[PDB]
Tab-separated table of C-alpha atoms in Angstrom:
chain	number	residue	atom	x	y	z
A	1	UNK	CA	188.465	199.884	-5.742
A	2	UNK	CA	186.019	198.767	-8.585
A	3	UNK	CA	185.820	195.755	-9.576
A	4	UNK	CA	186.059	194.346	-13.508
A	5	UNK	CA	185.798	191.257	-14.979
A	6	UNK	CA	187.502	189.890	-18.663
A	7	UNK	CA	187.780	187.094	-20.920
A	8	UNK	CA	191.401	185.054	-21.504
A	9	UNK	CA	192.341	187.610	-24.468
A	10	UNK	CA	191.741	190.843	-21.663
A	11	UNK	CA	188.139	191.665	-23.353
A	12	UNK	CA	185.834	193.687	-20.897
A	13	UNK	CA	183.011	191.463	-19.889
A	14	UNK	CA	181.651	193.126	-16.438
A	15	UNK	CA	182.705	196.432	-15.318
A	16	UNK	CA	181.052	197.242	-11.525
A	17	UNK	CA	178.672	200.131	-10.707
A	18	UNK	CA	182.355	202.186	-9.179
A	19	UNK	CA	184.253	202.606	-11.641
A	20	UNK	CA	181.914	205.215	-14.086
A	21	UNK	CA	183.035	207.839	-11.545
A	22	UNK	CA	185.801	206.469	-11.160
A	23	UNK	CA	187.845	206.038	-15.802
A	24	UNK	CA	184.225	207.826	-17.239
A	25	UNK	CA	183.376	205.631	-19.382
A	26	UNK	CA	179.620	204.083	-19.562
A	27	UNK	CA	179.400	200.034	-19.423
A	28	UNK	CA	178.313	199.617	-22.192
A	29	UNK	CA	181.227	201.413	-24.114
A	30	UNK	CA	184.000	199.744	-21.788
A	31	UNK	CA	182.576	196.630	-22.402
A	32	UNK	CA	183.430	193.773	-25.446
A	33	UNK	CA	186.735	195.889	-25.471
A	34	UNK	CA	190.555	194.665	-24.871
A	35	UNK	CA	191.739	196.360	-21.613
A	36	UNK	CA	194.860	196.990	-23.823
A	37	UNK	CA	192.720	199.878	-25.644
A	38	UNK	CA	193.198	202.185	-22.292
A	39	UNK	CA	196.595	200.617	-21.042
A	40	UNK	CA	199.125	204.245	-20.999
A	41	UNK	CA	202.265	203.237	-23.729
A	42	UNK	CA	205.094	203.484	-21.362
A	43	UNK	CA	202.986	199.968	-18.673
A	44	UNK	CA	201.373	198.070	-21.732
A	45	UNK	CA	205.053	196.113	-22.141
A	46	UNK	CA	204.841	195.120	-18.282
A	47	UNK	CA	201.432	194.680	-18.134
A	48	UNK	CA	200.527	192.264	-20.968
A	49	UNK	CA	204.140	190.408	-18.925
A	50	UNK	CA	201.376	190.216	-15.764
A	51	UNK	CA	198.095	188.956	-18.357
A	52	UNK	CA	200.989	186.448	-19.710
A	53	UNK	CA	201.689	185.047	-15.905
A	54	UNK	CA	197.969	184.973	-14.763
A	55	UNK	CA	197.193	182.490	-17.900
A	56	UNK	CA	199.730	180.553	-16.706
A	57	UNK	CA	199.600	180.289	-12.309
A	58	UNK	CA	196.694	179.885	-11.193
A	59	UNK	CA	197.778	182.053	-8.873
A	60	UNK	CA	196.786	186.358	-7.521
A	61	UNK	CA	199.067	188.809	-9.597
A	62	UNK	CA	199.037	192.185	-8.612
A	63	UNK	CA	200.535	194.718	-11.408
A	64	UNK	CA	202.815	197.193	-10.195
A	65	UNK	CA	201.184	200.804	-10.476
A	66	UNK	CA	200.146	201.445	-14.177
A	67	UNK	CA	198.358	204.506	-16.000
A	68	UNK	CA	194.468	203.823	-17.052
A	69	UNK	CA	193.224	206.018	-20.026
A	70	UNK	CA	189.355	207.954	-19.013
A	71	UNK	CA	186.700	208.833	-21.234
A	72	UNK	CA	189.014	212.068	-21.913
A	73	UNK	CA	191.858	210.386	-22.300
A	74	UNK	CA	193.669	211.562	-19.467
A	75	UNK	CA	195.242	209.053	-17.145
A	76	UNK	CA	194.360	208.023	-13.945
A	77	UNK	CA	197.147	205.371	-11.761
A	78	UNK	CA	195.352	201.852	-10.966
A	79	UNK	CA	196.546	199.016	-9.151
A	80	UNK	CA	194.931	195.814	-10.646
A	81	UNK	CA	195.026	192.558	-8.727
A	82	UNK	CA	194.095	190.018	-11.200
A	83	UNK	CA	193.017	186.069	-11.199
A	84	UNK	CA	192.394	183.877	-14.008
A	85	UNK	CA	189.970	181.156	-13.346
A	86	UNK	CA	190.422	177.815	-15.948
A	87	UNK	CA	187.318	175.464	-17.286
A	88	UNK	CA	188.388	171.793	-15.212
A	89	UNK	CA	186.703	170.468	-18.426
A	90	UNK	CA	188.122	172.353	-21.738
A	91	UNK	CA	191.381	173.928	-20.034
A	92	UNK	CA	189.736	177.295	-21.941
A	93	UNK	CA	189.615	180.469	-18.937
A	94	UNK	CA	185.826	181.603	-17.991
A	95	UNK	CA	187.243	184.486	-16.844
A	96	UNK	CA	190.271	186.525	-15.050
A	97	UNK	CA	188.580	188.520	-11.643
A	98	UNK	CA	190.493	191.859	-11.221
A	99	UNK	CA	190.076	194.177	-8.162
A	100	UNK	CA	191.710	197.394	-9.511
A	101	UNK	CA	192.409	200.429	-6.347
A	102	UNK	CA	193.076	203.973	-7.819
A	103	UNK	CA	194.910	206.275	-6.992
């Protein structure tokens, strides 16, 4: 229900308008941070494996429904569709598009 874009490492590069109402973070506090900073302890291992497969195959990867820590340090449930785009000259990832559905 909100879109974010990340580096190959998971660092937030962009968040759209709709996210602050959901996760409570303003853009300037979340941009530059890794998305490993917000994953619930119960889900970070499974989400890292999804991040691995995203960096390896040029295909959509849908995560499990995971918990994302909001600004008040409570959690919300998200399911994200991830896809990385590699630069054809350096093989580096320009960004990973993240479509985050909220529950």
